[PDB]
Design a protein around this ligand. Structure first.
Ligand SMILES: [Mg+2]
Lengths: 126, 34, 216, 365
């Protein structure tokens, strides 16, 4: 198609089969289809643990820096990958979500302790 | 921890659609209950 | 080739359509009219967001304030209720030019120009004011201008340099050793060149779009 | 209050004015509005200048309305606005002048301080202190208490009306409070300082009974709560001032009454506009009442209270100072007339040149 407007973006293009996802990191005009015309492939992401239990990310950090220097935006999933690698700072919502999970597990632990205390009262009743 | 004046500024801006204030999160990840 | 025939009707339509738009351009009194009972714009039937309902009934538009002043309040200071609530430091416009909408039966819609002073820092040139049709403006009284505009700047405490990300720092130090540069200096990012304005900072009205004149 | 010389119209009537038939000029403006074309400021000026009858005023009122709702509304000249008020007074149409003045947003009549005094003084001499009060409130809405002469006349009308009005509605308290405060701030005399404390008290009443938004909404007043705190500050300033300044006894009683009344009372526009950390004004009333008594004791101890009524103090102030202001204002009035005459001639000359060029353009075309 002959696009009018838009910008270059670095995003994940979904490949693979059903229940077997696999991503290609690519630089593409934002208006193009998710798996369609792209400008350059900048790596790959395999989200399924391998035999060694490792999720494998490949990043062409030399070309990634080139396209960020030319105005390429970044998708939020790609910003999370760059933060986990250490190439970018951790994304604000990566930290907030980790804090929300901590507060939610603290409640669960407290509720289990209260239930155990309630169970202890049942033990006292015998 | 946000300054107390800043927490009040947000309670005025979003008056009527507020949630319970959250304190500092646990220092470590609480061990998963099992 | 040479069988690509000319399309006279298409060229005629384009010009004719463009001409009608210029002739029947809508006015600010029509595009920005509002029905306060339903808080819906008659021109397009767009309902305002819920978070704007309270202020639409409780606050005034800019030219509603200025239509009551001599010379449409040239030289007067005007602030916004959103700024008053969000920022402790003085935020206001110094009005310089004002083009009311004569069509309006109360001269309550129009355009304005002025010099911005946001969070105590003043711009050097006058530009057009955005969001003039918002119910958020508060005229500053003449006797209260001196107390309102009084500001003393605090020394800037936002960091000027920060570390590099963990991987990007290791790649920099590794390059140093490869090139023979021996040093234990910590790579530092400079944040002074790239400091962001607040999200509510006034934007450029001149480059902003205007709604079309086709009613819904 | 003003002298006959201040209200004499020999100078205005002796102005050089072009003679244009209103009917002819009426047609020219009507065609421009039909064609959606801008009308000249000189055109509307010529119409107002050549008003010769009571009926002509009604037509000019319509054309002043049309000019306001036209592309060149901003260019309405000061002398055109002044002549309108002068013509209204000349032919007995004072109600029309007050109507257009109150409906400024529709007609665009924003008179200068000299013009305000001419209209305000007519009502004062006729004894119509209800219309005179309207002129004062319009001056307050426009924040036009710059000239000292206007300040004296405005304070005389306010205090005379307040004495008659034993009962004040909340809107009246707000309008009187703002008018007294703004007019009082300009004056540093005892009457001026008394009017500041009187105004803050009235506005403080509306703040603690109907909320702070009733005071500042649509009013030339600040939006920060604490008007009764401003009133007490005036007492603390006068008491501690090295210079000997006095506050009228009448105002002090008003503030005491306001504090007692508030202290022991018997669609989606509902917002809390004050931060939770900041103390509400109602909770601070106990502390406010202690400050008042301490300040009153210090003032009375220092003999800084004036038993004389505010209406009597203002009358003396007007008699003493108003004569001098009339001479100064009348001197500026003559200068303004000459400035207006020169600017008017420039517009007439510029119009002649463009019309001559228009002929040359048609000759070329
Ligand atoms: Mg926005």
């Amino acid at each position: 198609k002959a696009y009018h407007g838009g910008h270059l973006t670095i995003r994940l293009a979904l490949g693979g089969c059903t229940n077997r996802p696999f991503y290609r990191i690519v630089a593409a005009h934002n208006k193009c289809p998710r798996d369609g015309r792209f400008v350059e492939q900048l790596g790959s992401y395999d989200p399924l643990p391998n035999s060694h239990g490792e999720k494998l990310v490949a990043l062409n950090l030399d070309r990634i820096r080139h396209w960020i220097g030319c105005g390429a935006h970044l998708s939020k999933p790609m910003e999370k990958l760059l933060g986990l690698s250490g190439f970018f700072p951790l994304h604000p919502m990566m930290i907030t979500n980790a804090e929300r999970l901590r507060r939610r597990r603290a409640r669960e632990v407290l509720l289990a302790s209260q239930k155990a205390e309630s169970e202890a009262k049942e033990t006292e009743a015998s | 921890q946000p300054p107390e004046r800043e927490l009040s500024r947000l309670r005025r801006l979003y008056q009527g659609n507020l949630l319970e204030e959250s304190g500092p999160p646990p220092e470590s990840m609480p061990e998963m209950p099992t | 080739r040479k069988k690509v025939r000319p399309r006279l009707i298409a060229e005629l339509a384009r010009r004719v359509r463009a001409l009608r738009e210029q002739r029947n351009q809508p006015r600010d009194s029509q595009l920005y009219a509002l029905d306060y009972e339903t808080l819906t714009r008659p021109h397009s039937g767009r309902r305002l967001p819920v978070r704007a309902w309270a202020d639409v009934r409780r606050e005034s538009r800019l030219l509603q304030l200025l239509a009551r002043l001599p010379l449409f309040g040239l030289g007067r200071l005007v602030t916004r209720k959103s700024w008053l609530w969000q920022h402790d430091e003085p935020c206001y416009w110094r009005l310089t030019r004002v083009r009311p909408d004569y069509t309006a039966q109360n001269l309550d819609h129009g355009r304005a120009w002025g010099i911005l002073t946001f969070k105590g820092k003043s711009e050097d040139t006058a530009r057009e004011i955005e969001q003039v049709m918002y119910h958020d403006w508060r005229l500053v009284p003449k006797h209260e201008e001196e107390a309102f505009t009084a500001f003393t700047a605090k020394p800037e405490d936002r960091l000027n340099s920060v570390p590099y990300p963990p991987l990007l720092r290791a790649m920099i130090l590794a390059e140093r050793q490869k090139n023979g540069d021996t040093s234990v200096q910590e790579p530092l990012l400079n944040l002074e060149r790239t400091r962001m304005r607040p999200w509510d900072y006034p934007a450029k009205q001149e480059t902003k779009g205007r709604a079309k004149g086709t009613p819904v | 209050l003003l002298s006959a010389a201040y209200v004499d119209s020999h100078q205005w009537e002796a102005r050089e004015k072009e003679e244009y038939h209103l009917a002819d000029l009426a047609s020219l403006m009507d065609k421009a509005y039909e064609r959606k074309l801008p009308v000249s400021s000189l055109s509307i000026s010529r119409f107002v200048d050549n008003i010769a009858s009571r009926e002509d005023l009604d037509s000019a009122e319509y054309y002043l309305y049309k000019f306001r709702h036209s592309p060149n509304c901003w260019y309405l000249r000061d002398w055109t606005i002044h002549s309108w008020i002068r013509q209204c007074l000349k032919y007995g149409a004072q109600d029309k002048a007050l109507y257009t003045l109150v409906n400024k947003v529709q007609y665009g009549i924003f008179p200068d301080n000299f013009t305000f005094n001419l209209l305000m003084d007519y009502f004062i001499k006729k004894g119509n202190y209800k219309d005179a009060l309207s002129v004062v409130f319009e001056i307050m809405m426009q924040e036009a208490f710059d000239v000292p002469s206007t300040q004296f006349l405005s304070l005389y009308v306010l205090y005379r009306c307040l004495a008659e009005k034993t009962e004040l509605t909340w809107e009246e308290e707000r309008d009187f409070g703002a008018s007294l405060l703004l007019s009082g701030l300009k004056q540093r005399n005892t009457v001026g300082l008394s009017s500041q404390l009187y105004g803050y008290a009235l506005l403080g009443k509306v703040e603690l009974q109907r909320g702070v938004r009733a005071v500042y909404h649509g009013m030339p007043l600040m939006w920060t709560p604490g008007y009764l705190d401003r009133a007490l500050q005036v007492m603390e300033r006068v008491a501690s001032s090295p210079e000997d300044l006095k506050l009228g006894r009448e105002v002090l009683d008003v503030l005491d009454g306001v504090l007692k009344v508030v202290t022991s009372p018997d669609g989606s526009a509902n917002l809390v506009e004050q931060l939770d950390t900041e103390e509400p004004e109602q909770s601070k009333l106990p502390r406010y009442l202690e400050r008042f008594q301490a300040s009153r004791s210090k003032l009375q101890e220092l003999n800084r209270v004036e038993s004389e009524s505010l209406l009597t103090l203002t009358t003396q102030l007007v008699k003493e100072k108003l004569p001098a202001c009339e001479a100064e204002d009348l001197a500026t009035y003559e200068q303004k007339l000459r400035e207006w005459h020169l600017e008017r001639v420039q517009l007439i000359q510029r119009e002649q040149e463009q019309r001559e060029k228009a002929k040359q353009e048609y000759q070329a075309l």
